[PDB]
From a paper:
[name]-059 was also captured in an active state, with an open channel gate. When focussing onto the gating core, opening of the M3 gate was still apparent in the presence of [name]-059, although the gate constriction point (at [name] Thr621/[name] Thr625) was slightly wider without the NAM (by ~0.5 Å). Therefore, even the bulkiest NAM does not compromise an open gate conformation, underscoring mechanistic differences to NAMs targeting the core receptor (such as perampanel). Based on a resting state structure in complex with [name]-118, it has been hypothesized that NAM binding precludes outward movement of the M3 gating helices;40 however, the highly similar architecture of active states in the absence and presence of a NAM suggests other contributors underlying NAM action, as investigated below. Unexpectedly, one ligand ([name]-61432059) acts bifunctionally, negatively affecting [name] but exerting positive modulatory action on [name]-containing AMPARs, in a [name] stoichiometry-dependent manner.
Residue numbers in the entry:
A (entry chain A), B (entry chain C): 389 to 543, 565 to 771, 779 to 815
C (entry chain J), D (entry chain I): 18 to 53, 79 to 185, 196 to 234
E (entry chain D), F (entry chain B): 393 to 549, 570 to 773, 783 to 819
The structure:
Amino acid sequence: RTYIVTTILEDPYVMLKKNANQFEGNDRYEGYCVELAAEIAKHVGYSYRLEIVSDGKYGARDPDTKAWNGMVGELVYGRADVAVAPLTITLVREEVIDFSKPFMSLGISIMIKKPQKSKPGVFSFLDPLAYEIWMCIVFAYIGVSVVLFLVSRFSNEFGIFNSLWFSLGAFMQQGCDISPRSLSGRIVGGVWWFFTLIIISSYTANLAAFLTVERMVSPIESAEDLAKQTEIAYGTLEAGSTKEFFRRSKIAVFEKMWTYMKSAEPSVFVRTTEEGMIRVRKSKGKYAYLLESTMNEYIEQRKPCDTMKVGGNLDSKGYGIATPKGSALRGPVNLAVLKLSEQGVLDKLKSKWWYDKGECGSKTSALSLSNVAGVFYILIGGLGLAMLVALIEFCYKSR
Amino acid sequence: RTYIVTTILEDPYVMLKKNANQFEGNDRYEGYCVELAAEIAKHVGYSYRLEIVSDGKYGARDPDTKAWNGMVGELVYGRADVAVAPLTITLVREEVIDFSKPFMSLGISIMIKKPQKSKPGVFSFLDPLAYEIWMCIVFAYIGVSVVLFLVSRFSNEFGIFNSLWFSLGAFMQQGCDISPRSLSGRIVGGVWWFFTLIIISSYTANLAAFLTVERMVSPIESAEDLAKQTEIAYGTLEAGSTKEFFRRSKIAVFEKMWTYMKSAEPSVFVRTTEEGMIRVRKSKGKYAYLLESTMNEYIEQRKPCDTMKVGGNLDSKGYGIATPKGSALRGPVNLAVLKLSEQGVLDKLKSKWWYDKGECGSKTSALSLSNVAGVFYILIGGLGLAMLVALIEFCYKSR
Amino acid sequence: GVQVLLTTIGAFAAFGLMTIAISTDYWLYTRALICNGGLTHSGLWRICCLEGLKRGVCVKINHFPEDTDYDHDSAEYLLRVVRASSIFPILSAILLLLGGVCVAASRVYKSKRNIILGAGILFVAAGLSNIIGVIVYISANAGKNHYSYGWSFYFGGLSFILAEVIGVLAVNIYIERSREAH
Amino acid sequence: GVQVLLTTIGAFAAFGLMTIAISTDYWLYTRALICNGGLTHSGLWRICCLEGLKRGVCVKINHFPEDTDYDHDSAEYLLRVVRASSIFPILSAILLLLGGVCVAASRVYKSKRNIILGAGILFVAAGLSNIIGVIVYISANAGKNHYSYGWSFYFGGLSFILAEVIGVLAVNIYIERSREAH
Amino acid sequence: KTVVVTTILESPYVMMKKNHEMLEGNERYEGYCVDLAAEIAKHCGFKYKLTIVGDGKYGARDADTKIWNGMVGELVYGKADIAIAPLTITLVREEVIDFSKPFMSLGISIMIKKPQKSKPGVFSFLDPLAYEIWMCIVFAYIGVSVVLFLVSRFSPYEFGIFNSLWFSLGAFMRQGCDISPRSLSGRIVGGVWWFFTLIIISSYTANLAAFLTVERMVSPIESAEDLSKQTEIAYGTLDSGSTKEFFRRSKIAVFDKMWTYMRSAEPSVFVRTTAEGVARVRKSKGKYAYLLESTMNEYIEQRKPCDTMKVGGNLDSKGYGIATPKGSSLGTPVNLAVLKLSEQGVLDKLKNKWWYDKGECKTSALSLSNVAGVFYILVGGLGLAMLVALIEFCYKSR
Amino acid sequence: KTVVVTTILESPYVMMKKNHEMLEGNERYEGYCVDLAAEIAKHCGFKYKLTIVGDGKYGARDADTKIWNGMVGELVYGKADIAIAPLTITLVREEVIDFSKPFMSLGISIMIKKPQKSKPGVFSFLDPLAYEIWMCIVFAYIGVSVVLFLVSRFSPYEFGIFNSLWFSLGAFMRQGCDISPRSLSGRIVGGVWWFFTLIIISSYTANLAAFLTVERMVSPIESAEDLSKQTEIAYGTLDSGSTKEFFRRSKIAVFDKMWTYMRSAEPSVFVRTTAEGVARVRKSKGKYAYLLESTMNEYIEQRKPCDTMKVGGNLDSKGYGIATPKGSSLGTPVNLAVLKLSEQGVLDKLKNKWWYDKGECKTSALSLSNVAGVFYILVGGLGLAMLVALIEFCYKSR
Ligand SMILES: O=C1Cc2cc(-c3c(-c4ccc(F)cc4)nn4c(N5CCC(O)CC5)nccc34)ccc2N1
Ligand SMILES: O=C1Cc2cc(-c3c(-c4ccc(F)cc4)nn4c(N5CCC(O)CC5)nccc34)ccc2N1
Ligand SMILES: N[C@@H](CCC(=O)O)C(=O)O
Ligand SMILES: N[C@@H](CCC(=O)O)C(=O)O
């Protein structure tokens, strides 16, 4: 006799295979819970027929009608004999259905849209100074070289070319083969020296500041961080255990969060997890979805993986396999679950469905060649240019 | 008819004049409360006779006998008609005596013995490197100069003197009038250059670290900071309002503090404020006296002024003038007090008795000439030595 | 001979470039809350908006107030006066004109060899004034959203480069003339 | 003539200073938990306490273990071996002895002028070994309470200074001899 | 049975709830004083109805009619029985009504428009060293050059005064000149100068990033005396308040001068409401200052738009005190309630909730405006050099 | 009426009060499990007496006698009725008794002696740059010297290979050599080399303080595989516990190898108590490792003497679970009590109180040991130079 298996379509626990329309039945579905149920049936020795919860809601109680919706609704009212879905365990649901021992842990987690990384380019060594400063430095170098040539020459080795060489070597603090002997040339040299000293000191200090700094600041970084602010609105999934957890909380922070959520215009509550994921992804940093750590990690791992988890889990709980109260299946299922946990099976499944995909692989640390490759490219360009000019001078000298 | 005035001997509110034995009566005493009472009597139009509380305790109730000790004891039982002393105002005392409007504010404050300042000397610019490094630098300079002279000479301008000059200029990065042409001399020069580069970079980096750092870390810096630790014991003054405040507290931190204090071996409670002041001053950083902010500030101002106040005041309250319940003096006294506060009198008295004495006057800030005067002294010494050697060379050349 | 002609054409080209950049109003490409901010191609004198409600209508600027009208005679007011007057680029243009005039007059009186020397000095001073002008222009605009520079900017820069080159050439001409004198 | 005698006496003085410092045990003045820490005047080989229960009794040191006996062949064990053996100061003394011997032998065979050159090289190498020895000595003692150095330390330093001076003088002598040869 | 409670809407003490049109009863009022009255009535047990004053004034007396306005007039004339309000204690009001022990402390203070951050100024590169250090540096440069000059003239083994200055300057800027001393006496001077430069330049370079990017906020007034000195800047107070009475009844010279100014400063600097002064300061381009209690400034500076600031310290110290009419039986228990709340720590919690909980208010690449002064200096030096060359040319030509 | 409560003294779960000789009743026990049992009995309503096990063992079964020891044997054999303890859930124990939902999560972990901090090593001055950067720097030095050589031979206006290398080296170290290029092609190379040196040296100098003073703590084992590979280092577990059973019943290769080692490693690595393993690790000079639950390691590392550390991650994940005998009426309500406590957040508060609240665990001038390697390099270079000079002298003399 086949056993009904109510589930829910939430990746990666359950998903529709590529080309699902062609496929049918259990073979169409694929996800963590699928392998979990397969293994459970193998260890118990029965056969199961998959089925989805029509409402698509995990499960909850209508306070007026006092009825159960979702997968718990199906299980209580005899529709389904088993619920292999990620049913969070709570006091209210455990009164009416027999949960099994948890097969995974989690907690309430905060999601945010990934801020701009501000990745450093190859020419990251110019960052400490504005490009404006660099170019005005070049222009000042030309001006001072010309002035030096002029004052020195008109009634000496200080021609224009040697003037440029002298001023360049002075800026780089590599000394000079020649130095001014006249008063005007010496004034120019001293002023250029002062300018060089100031500018180079500024560059070095600002660079030290740069390399001893990272953009690790988080917008909220705490639960009360969500409460204090108002530009970003935080909400949950309707008919989800976190909604009840906030509803029945007895803490100041959770009371305030529940007050805000219940009196949020427009309705912060979302119909489905993907709804909140897209809301944050398209909120321009305006939504702060509250969900379970597992989904948050999976999403932060999947491409575009443009979302991040912030803060520590508010509370600790775990999923669990459910059966109807008084069902004969409760006994062995626990046992099976334990087997898996002690056999490393659940660990392998978690690793497979959360890490193998690996869409994106995203105290003082040494500099990487990427930070400073631009100067190497500049060096190669200069060497090539020097060889070219050597060839040109060779041709000119020959002719 | 003279009015009895019970007080207490705690500086600076009340103090014994120098050569007190010669003096007698009110003229022997001097302190803030003395001028306060003088002004109060002048504004009211009566005369007063000073008197001290024999027990020396501010005031409290024996829970068994249910009697009052101290100044409050004297006032309740008719001994004294007025109490101009710094009586902290509380619910328990206000039931039985008529306090007046507060004439000063305060709060519970934490005292600690002043840690070592680690004042910087004139030769503070050598701190980034150990003296060992400097002296081994000198010895390496000598060794490398000798090796250079040697390798260069034996089968050149690289004599011993010029070798020392070259190596010194290389270390200071001021260039060289001459440079090695031989292989061995060039190896020596390159190695000395490497050493100089490493050492100077280290000095500059460590100096930047030094100048961007100050010793502002506090041992506790909070009330719970006292609770967590145990090497330092914190206690109060027996028969003082702070003891009751801790006794009747309803907070976790205050409950823990009261538990520790009541179960402290040996008895943390002190007989008098000077007792706790000396206990902290001679505890080698083992006692953390809890008192009122006014006394803490006065002591932190008075020589040796080797004590510091830490953290923010735990609670807010103020002193007050007291009279017996049902006394006719309650009415005008309040008025007088208010007059003073609105006339600036109390402000002037506070400033006088807390700031005029001025025993000791103890973000990025420019360097002071004190930080870097040692190098100036070195420069002057070198100039004098140079003149002396010039004279010696002049005499030698003449002869 | 050829060198003097190159000097003259370079001087006139630099003068034309600098005058164009001064009169032209395509220096800066920034967004401002001055047109119904929105994309705007500004200039040294007048700020002209584009792709907006006006889509071509534009006006001068209130450099001295900047809508603040505070902190008078505080070393920032002087910068504002200099920026508004644009005295330094105009001085550069004047110096270029006078230097070109002196170079041309050199052909008239070849005996007086100091004329080209004065011309070269004027060109160098023009370069200095130009660089000061761009410095103050950039320093004033600070009073952070995206921004960019237009072709009048680079016209002024080219004027400066030409001025430096022409100063070099004129000095060389003076050296050659004095050497020929012996 | 006078210069050679000064060379010889300086060499022997440096050798005596270095040997004294090696044999002597007043290098470091620190407190340690080795005597019933308490004031202690240590040395290169043996650590001797003072103003304590022993008040004069003292023993050698376990340089290699240091009571840790871990991390073998990890670039720190080599430092410990070098420090314990004190091979470098001993090498300095040996080199000083050989250099003085060569200088003395120079008087025997004035024709062979390279002897003093070898002596000067030996003195310089002795200086290098001495400075290495002090470096390793200081680096090992790190393995923070007050500390201070004694007169054997400065005796070794004086040995180094004399070695440098003597190397200079011997090289000068070689130059003079070869110049006289022409 | 119910108690007549008087108040005013001086936030955050008393302020209406959002969408209060649908709110009825005492629930339409939220704040610090509403809470306080709640616990006071709890401890004493009575019942209260929260009522505002039509005159919208804290209270004062008219020197001609000898009549009382606002809360004080209400309580004295029987229209109410208690005032759990931000009412300020003073001598005059105590003569007619009975206050309690203060439930929060305060002092007068000054409110001004927040100035625009002072962008770092030209010559900012001299900041990391005190001017005395620069003077000593110049003196040492002169002295080293002179000593080198004397030593190389008297005892030589060429170093004139000009070339000696050139050498010292080059050594200071880490540029080696062509000539180097050859005498021991000159070389000693060179060595010490080199060491001096190493130390000084390293110290200067270490702390140079800070002094270039920091913008300092400085106000034209730093205290009350600076305000009295400046007559162009206008200052005023609430029309009927302890502040105006305190200035009027004062005997200190500074406050008497302020009172003369206010009594003569046309137009009337006085306002009718705190928010009026807030707006006036926010809408006067920094030409106006407002004198008020420090609690309101602390609340405002902690709340957006955060376009204003508190300057200086507190001129006088006072406290807010619950009030009751003479002979009331409520006066005795309210004092005990206040003391009990203070001991319990409730008042501190309320203060933190309504003041701190409402708080609403980096490595950057250097900008050319930061280092434009050195460019100006450079160009000036170039112009000076050309001028000097022309002068030398003319002198030689004659 | 009273409930039989079984526990063990595994701190901080259960630990006796100080001076307990004068303590009587359940009050002599303090900890996390005692509190938990308190709230469980409160919610359920029953009464409890806290009792320790004489055998002092958590529980296990003997494969020969098929007998149960410790708590499991007690509950199965009727000596008690409940275990509010740090008992670990597992398949075998569930077959015989009924557990609850876990009240705290954990995993196996490894305990080792904290190594002495690795003082920074010789050649620490190369750290701020990656070795690839150094290799590219050397290649660029060679290339620049070669290019200068070719350019100055083919198209001159002397720069041999030797002098070219000297010039490049001097430019890299901010020392100017006597010779400078005179040709445009050579001067371009010089300029780009100068810019390269400026950038590289500034970058190196910026982050140099950190890499000189940092002490890095590194363990010989970084994971379980590294432990299995190393046979000299000894590891053991508690004799009767879920850890030993888990290793014994495992089927993974790594754990099977570990089990063979333990079953054969003489002397018996197994201990009888957690504190025994703590002392053994603390008294073995880092030659011993202990496998235990992560909660105990977190407690210990957070408590003085803080002479030990946790290494790696958790091999397996499990949870502590209250237990009751088969068919007990208490089993149903204890589950609900645990869930209610979890929802209320009590368990988190207890965890923080008994773990985090018990926590018991700068610019320094450079020491010569930090920069001794450069001195060694210097002296080695000097010796090499003297040797080379002697070799040249001999070659010339022949
Ligand atoms: O009257 C004037 C106007 C002027 C502008 C300049 C100039 C130039 C320039 C000009 C002409 C060229 F042919 C090439 C470059 N670039 N430049 C920059 N930067 C380069 C590109 C920018 O986007 C970022 C930084 N910052 C500040 C100034 C500046 C130089 C002199 C003068 N004199
Ligand atoms: O075998 C040896 C032993 C030795 C020691 C030294 C020496 C000397 C020294 C020695 C002899 C003198 F005449 C003058 C100075 N001072 N010194 C220091 N410091 C000076 C004073 C200290 O208190 C703080 C820092 N640190 C490390 C080493 C050192 C040099 C060479 C050698 N070779
Ligand atoms: N409550 C205060 C307000 C006065 C003021 O704001 O200046 C009073 O009664 O005077
Ligand atoms: N409570 C655990 C302890 C085992 C261990 O410490 O390894 C058990 O019952 O197995």
